[PDB]
Every structure is written in structure tokens, then in C-alpha cells.
Ligand binder design. Structure first.
Ligand code: GTP
Ligand code: OXL
Ligand code: MN
Ligand code: MN
Ligand code: MN
Ligand code: NA
Length: 610
């Protein structure tokens, strides 16, 4: 199948065999090898020997350091240009812009970024030819979801980054068993390169290959492709997570009738042994991982984690909304993680964990802002920028969105059903974000449609809208996403979860948090649980149902200002409704569903009667 010798890449395979790949996986690999010109092709097996050897290789090259205080833990320090997702370089390609994002009445969209097929083709041609010269192309066969689950979906990621291979081993199920499960089926095609072919054209910084100027994270849902160039970091390189399991998957979910969401999934057991599963969407920086792994303060309750970040949810034959965690690990923010804020994460991350952009202590441990624990005298700190550091210093010792990357099966409170292939039955959906003023600790939506409106009104901070926690992640037009959520009410026999909204972040007149939060949030979960069971524990208000006086267990919290935390001001809510109206008109306009407009007016009307 060639007149010469450059099409068949068999001679460059250094692990596995192209002949044993399913036919369409071989075509994907070989086509991209022809394009990218890697030196070597390594078909990953997912084995512990492969992983160990690749960590040791990175360690020898200076790409990662072993953290000698802990068991098989590692630290990567990046080029400070690479350190986060970059929305302006994250795009979705469709034939028509409006299918990807609504057309905003002014400015640019806050709800996604479209690129034309033409522009993408030019961008691709300016980046990928030859991009892997001198490097190994690793072929990562991975499952998003428990292997073999009816709700799981398989991808193949090609990458030139060992860091990505190691991290994908933690964050997804990868290796030979996935190829076996895939057989001749369909898969999402994921192509990644750090964009630094050898010999290097530009200086390597911190032993971290990246190409910031050309960084581009593209999604082609009608080709079932994700193509990412130039960043080695996080959501830009681990293509299963945000690119596949939110942006691609949300588009698929819309077409097929299910939901792909930026939600934790937790199981909560009351003192009588009754257990329910809840899903919660909070924006980045608003505490999903804390809640998902909560150590409850209320005696007799238990919380167990199914996932901390992404949920795929589909109604079953009996009308239960079943959720799976499509991830295999937790890719959690390190700063702010302490024994007080997340004791179960602290336990989790002491073995088999990769840390990125945190500080290292002189005894080979980790450190970060908010770790809230002192070091022995004499123990010194190296910042994430590889410089000596002391607490008085002007800049943080860890990057603010530095991360740990840890196996889920580790977590001491991992839920027993976290890999059940049928998924767990969701009985409540929680929305929430950071509202320093106005918004009570917890309220319950009046209806499904009201709950969709409440999702649409979420904020990641007082100022910033982040509907459904999906602002950076919508795979398609957010108006159409709202219509898709609203359509669930018309699915016969659907057991629609109860919808709540929480606010951990209300502040008093002095800027102090009114609610202590963290494991105390168990008290709010208890109220939700009773509400799902039909307890008469709610009082009707203009915004939804709130707890009755005395309904929340506040034992141990007598210093809480209840009236203030729980207060609803006409003045605040008049302004809230006007702000929501202006935001939806500006950002959604012609794509805003009937029923969302109707919920906005209904809320305005109820507030007018206060
Ligand atoms: N006051 C208060 N802060 C909280 C609570 N739970 C979490 N936080 C804060 O939430 C932040 C940590 O949340 P993140 O790990 O960034 O949130 P996430 O939702 O997991 O974000 P991604 O992993 O980026 O999706 C820190 O600032 C915490 O102090 C709470 O109950 N009360
Ligand atoms: O990495 C994440 O979870 C994020 O950015 O939301
Ligand atoms: Mn070398
Ligand atoms: Mn998180
Ligand atoms: Mn997230
Ligand atoms: Na480095």
C-alpha cells in the first residue's frame, strides 16, 4: 500500500504492533504519524511497568522530580506561560457560528468561541506538519467511564508528551484492555502535540515543552475530533477531561438525549442507613471537590465520592436519571486544600500522585497557599518557580490553580458504586457559586423549569455569570442547551431530580463569611435529603423554598446569624432580576427559550409583591 517506504510506519513502533490495532485506530495513528513525523510510535499498554519506566525517564531528563517524603509521588514545574486553560485559544468548529454560540447583542460571547472550518484548516496546517520530529508519538487508548459500561465512551489520544501519558493513566482508564473493549467500534479521535519539534527552534524553559504563541485547543464535533497544539498543561493536553467529556460529550448528549455536565456526584447516607445520590454544579473555584469528598460534621452521616468534576447522566428504562463519573482520578486544585477544608483529599494525595506547579519542602514534601500547617524549624521551601521562598514573600509559593492528579480508587471515601456500569440514580441536582450578597444559604426550586432558570442564573463570583458551571465548556449554543435541559420535563416517566441552589459564600457587613462551610455543609445536605423524602421542612418564599425556622440542625453553630444568612431583600432581588434580564438578553437573546423568559417574569412578579 505504497510505491515507496514512507506510509507504513511499522518500522518505528517501539511498543505494541500496528497490525494488532483495530483497522480504524491504525489508520488514525498512521495518518497522524505521516503528518507529524514522530521518530518512534509507542502504543501504550497501561501497565505499571510502562508507567514506572516512563516516570523514571522523565525524572532522568529533568522533566519531573520524585517527592521523597511520599510514596511514588512526583512534581512537575511548568513553563509559567503554559499554567492553565486559555479560553481565547479554545475553539469549536462548526459550519455555522450560531450552532456553537449565541450571537451576543454586543461585544463578544462569554459562552464559547467559534472558529470557521476554513480558519481552522489554515491554523492546523501552520502547526501540525512535522511537529513531532525527533519525538515519540504515544498512542493512548482510553475509556471515559467504567470500562465496558453502556454509558462509557472510548477515545484514542496521540501525544508527544510523556507527562500527558502518565496523567492520562490516572485520569482515565487506559491501555490494552481498552483496545480490546473497543474492537471495531467508534472512538473520539484526540490529537495532541506540545508543538516543539526537534531540533528546538526556541529555548526550552523549565524542561517544559510548549509553544504558547501557537497554542490552540480545537474541537470538531461533526468530525468527532479534538485537536490540541502547543500546551502541555491540564485541560489543554489531557483531552478526555474537558475537551471530550464536556465539550464534545455535551454536543453528543444533546443529540442523543442525555447530559454531560460539570458536576460532582456524591452518595449521602443518613443515620438510618438510607442513601441517596446528588449531583452538584459549581463553577471552578467554588468548591466542588470539597463537597464531593466532604467529611460531614453531623454525627451518623456519611458522604462518599463518585466523582468530583464531570457527570454523564442518562435516564434509564425506569425513568431514573443515572450518572457516571467518566473520569478515573481527581485533578484537583491544590492551594486551599488542608486538613480543615478537605481532609479526605489530604489522605488521598500521599501516594501515587502527580503534582503540578506546587512548592516543594526540603524534606521532599509539598506545600501551597492555604495548606494551613506549619513546617518544623529548619524546613525550607522551594517555590513552583524553582526559587527559594519564605512566607513573607510577595508572590505565592504555588501557582493559584496548581493541581494534584490522583487515582480515584485511592480515595478513602470513594463510593462503592463509583464504577458501577449502570450509574447511580440522581435524586437531587445542586447549583451554586459565590454570592457575597443577597442569596440565602440554600433554596429549592419550584419546578423543573424554575430549576433550569436557577442554573442559568448561577455565578462564579458576585460579578460573573457562569450558567450551570459550564461557561468555558458548552459544546454548542447555550440557548439550545437550555432548551435541551427543559425538554427533560417532557420525557414520559422521567423521575426529575429536585433542584436546589446553595451559597457557601454570603458575607456579613464586615466581609466575614456568615456560614462556616466545609464539613458543616452536611447540615444543608441533611435538609435536602429530607426534602427529597417529602418532609414538611420548607417555607415558601419569592425565590423558592427555604428551610423552616428550626429545620436546619445548627447544634455546635450558635454563633451563626440566621436571619442575616437566610434574609431575602426586595431591593436586592429586584436588582438581581434586572441583571439576569440584561445578561440573558445580551448573551442569549434570540436563542433564549420561552420557558426561561417565563421564569424570569414569574420571579420578577413574585418579588413585586413583596
Ligand atoms: N467559604 C467557603 N469556601 C469554600 C467552601 N468549599 C470550598 N470553598 C472554597 O472553594 C475553593 C476551592 O474550590 P476549587 O477546588 O477551586 O473548586 P472546584 O469546583 O473543585 O474547581 P475545578 O476543580 O476547577 O472544577 C477554595 O477557595 C475554598 O476555600 C465552603 O464551604 N466555604
Ligand atoms: O480543571 C478543572 O476542573 C477546571 O478548570 O474546571
Ligand atoms: Mn533523552
Ligand atoms: Mn475540583
Ligand atoms: Mn472543573
Ligand atoms: Na519543569
Amino acid at each position: 500500500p505504497q510505491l515507496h517506504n514512507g506510509l507504513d510506519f511499522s518500522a518505528k513502533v517501539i511498543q505494541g504492533s500496528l497490525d494488532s490495532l483495530p483497522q480504524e485506530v491504525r489508520k488514525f495513528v498512521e495518518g497522524n504519524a505521516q503528518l507529524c513525523q514522530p521518530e518512534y510510535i509507542h502504543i501504550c499498554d497501561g501497565s505499571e511497568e510502562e508507567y514506572g519506566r516512563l516516570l523514571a525517564h522523565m525524572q532522568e531528563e529533568g522533566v519531573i522530580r520524585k517527592l521523597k517524603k511520599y510514596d511514588n509521588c512526583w512534581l512537575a514545574l511548568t513553563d509559567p506561560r503554559d499554567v492553565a486553560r486559555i479560553e481565547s485559544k479554545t475553539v469549536i468548529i462548526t459550519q455555522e457560528q450560531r450552532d456553537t454560540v449565541p450571537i451576543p447583542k454586543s461585544g463578544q460571547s462569554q459562552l464559547g468561541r467559534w472558529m470557521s472550518e476554513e480558519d481552522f484548516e489554515k491554523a492546523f496546517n501552520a502547526r501540525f506538519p512535522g511537529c513531532m520530529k525527533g519525538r515519540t508519538m504515544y498512542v493512548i487508548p482510553f475509556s471515559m467511564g467504567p470500562l465496558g459500561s453502556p454509558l462509557a465512551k472510548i477515545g484514542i489520544e496521540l501525544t508527544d508528551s510523556p507527562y500527558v501519558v502518565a496523567s492520562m493513566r490516572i485520569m482515565t482508564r487506559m491501555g490494552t484492555s481498552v483496545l480490546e473493549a473497543l474492537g471495531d467500534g467508534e472512538f473520539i479521535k484526540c490529537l495532541h502535540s506540545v508543538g516543539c519539534p526537534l531540533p528546538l527552534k526556541k529555548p526550552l524553559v523549565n524542561n517544559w515543552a510548549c509553544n504558547p504563541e501557537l497554542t490552540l485547543i480545537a474541537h470538531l464535533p461533526d468530525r468527532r475530533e479534538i485537536i490540541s497544539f502547543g500546551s502541555g498543561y491540564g485541560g489543554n493536553s489531557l483531552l478526555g477531561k474537558k475537551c471530550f467529556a464536556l465539550r464534545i460529550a455535551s454536543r453528543l448528549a444533546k443529540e442523543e438525549g442525555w447530559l454531560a455536565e460539570h458536576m460532582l456526584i456524591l452518595g449521602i447516607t443518613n443515620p438510618e442507613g438510607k442513601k441517596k445520590y446528588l449531583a452538584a454544579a459549581f463553577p471552578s473555584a467554588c468548591g466542588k471537590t470539597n463537597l464531593a469528598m466532604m467529611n460531614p460534621t453531623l454525627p451518623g452521616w456519611k458522604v462518599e465520592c463518585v466523582g468530583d468534576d464531570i457527570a454523564w447522566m442518562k435516564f434509564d428504562a425506569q425513568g431514573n436519571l443515572r450518572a457516571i463519573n467518566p473520569e478515573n482520578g481527581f485533578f484537583g486544585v491544590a492551594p486551599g486544600t488542608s486538613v480543615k477544608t478537605n481532609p479526605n483529599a489530604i489522605k488521598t494525595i500521599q501516594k501515587n500522585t502527580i503534582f503540578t506547579n506546587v512548592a516543594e519542602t526540603s524534606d521532599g514534601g509539598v506545600y501551597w497557599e492555604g495548606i494551613d500547617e506549619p513546617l518544623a524549624p529548619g524546613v525550607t521551601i522551594t517555590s513552583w518557580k524553582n526559587k527559594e521562598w519564605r512566607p513573607q514573600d510577595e508572590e505565592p509559593c504555588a501557582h493559584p490553580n496548581s493541581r494534584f492528579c490522583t487515582p480515584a480508587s485511592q480515595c478513602p471515601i470513594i463510593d462503592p458504586a463509583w464504577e458501577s456500569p449502570e450509574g447511580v440514580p440522581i435524586e437531587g441536582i445542586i447549583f451554586g457559586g459565590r454570592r457575597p450578597a443577597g442569596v440565602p444559604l440554600v433554596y429549592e426550586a419550584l419546578s423543573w423549569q424554575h430549576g433550569v432558570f436557577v442554573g442559568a442564573a448561577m455565578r462564579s463570583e458576585g460579578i460573573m455569570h457562569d450558567p450551570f458551571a459550564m461557561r468555558p465548556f458548552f459544546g454548542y449554543n447555550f440557548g439550545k442547551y437550555l432548551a435541551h435541559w427543559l425538554s427533560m420535563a417532557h420525557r414520559p416517566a422521567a423521575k426529575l431530580p429536585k433542584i436546589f441552589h446553595v451559597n457557601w459564600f454570603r458575607k456579613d457587613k464586615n466581609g466575614k463569611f456568615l456560614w462556616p462551610g466545609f464539613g458543616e455543609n452536611s447540615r444543608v445536605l441533611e435538609w435536602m435529603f429530607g426534602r427529597i423524602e417529602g418532609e414538611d421542612s420548607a417555607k415558601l418564599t419569592p425565590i423558592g423554598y427555604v428551610p423552616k425556622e428550626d429545620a436546619l440542625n445548627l447544634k455546635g453553630l450558635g454563633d451563626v446569624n440566621v436571619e442575616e444568612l437566610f434574609g431575602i431583600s426586595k431591593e436586592f432581588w429586584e436588582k438581581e432580576v434586572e441583571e439576569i434580564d440584561k445578561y440573558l438578553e445580551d448573551q442569549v437573546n434570540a436563542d433564549l427559550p420561552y420557558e426561561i423568559e417565563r421564569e424570569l417574569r414569574a420571579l420578577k412578579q413574585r418579588i413585586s409583591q413583596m
